[PDB]
Design a protein around this nucleic acid. Structure first.
Ligand code: ZN
Ligand code: ZN
Ligand code: ZN
Ligand code: ZN
Lengths: 145, 146
DNA sequence: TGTTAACTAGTTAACA
DNA sequence: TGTTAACTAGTTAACA
């Protein structure tokens, strides 16, 4: 198989692996509270910094419309709460309820375990082989802008 | 978690972000005069190789027969394909292209060829050794998604 | 900025 | 096998 066909099939492999999620994780979500990957990710963000619809939408690279509806569902489930920015009283801020704290922490640990799998995948290669690969990734990502 | 893992993780991110609504990854613009999803065009492409059924098409696309039903219907309401059930009482329900779709089908096949070509050019920037290291990295990654 | 209308392109499962 | 009905989690347009 050509290097060209391999890249082709690899891309399609991760496509079906992702299904209808918007991010790649390895292993199963170990949170009893059941939420979309996107929702859990949002909770992860609010653990770091209180924020707005816009700020959330950009980190996730999805539409403010999609955020409006994810935030709303988390708000029905009392996982988040709104308040107003101090500088501009009209600005709507979102932050976590206590109940959401572990859900976010579980999502953070999930990302962290996905990264460990990669690091150890990267460790089957010499500092140089790794360098080659790093170049490859920079080359490939570039095609995608 | 070090530089390499993070670069990998981010790269997968860039793919998902490029993926969007499409269930396929193709580079460049879809130069087809008709506005169709890549899934719908890819169907047209398959039908050009071989008359077939909802199931065989669903198998090949790795999507559900219900998804196939809905896609076939849009293709059909745009008079790009036709079904045997309007003219034949055979048990098999076969889908075929209308002459209007022949070129669209051809364009989609070409789009795929060009995308392969772009990939090859990218890899051509590497020695045959360097392509073997890359090829082992790709195989190793593919493993994690089994 | 942020939210609904209308849509989208997929999913599962019950059933001629 | 292929259709449908119910659902799902995105999208853009336009204007609230
Ligand atoms: Zn989780
Ligand atoms: Zn996440
Ligand atoms: Zn096309
Ligand atoms: Zn295609």
């Amino acid at each position: 198989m050509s290097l060209a066909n391999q890249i082709d099939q690899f891309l399609g492999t991760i496509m079906q692996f992702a299904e209808n999620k918007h991010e790649i994780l390895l292993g199963k979500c170990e949170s009893d509270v059941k939420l979309t990957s996107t929702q859990e990710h949002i909770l992860m963000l609010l653990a770091e910094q209180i924020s707005t619809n816009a700020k959330i939408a950009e980190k996730l690279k999805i539409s403010p419309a999609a955020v409006t509806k994810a935030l709303k569902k988390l708000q029905e489930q009392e996982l988040i709460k709104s308040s107003r920015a101090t500088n501009d009283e009209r600005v709507v801020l979102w932050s976590l309820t206590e109940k959401a704290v572990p859900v976010a922490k579980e999502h953070a640990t999930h990302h962290e375990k996905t990264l460990s799998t990669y690091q150890e995948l990267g460790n089957k290669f010499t500092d140089e082989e790794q360098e080659v690969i790093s170049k490859f990734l920079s080359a490939l990502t570039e095609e995608f802008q």
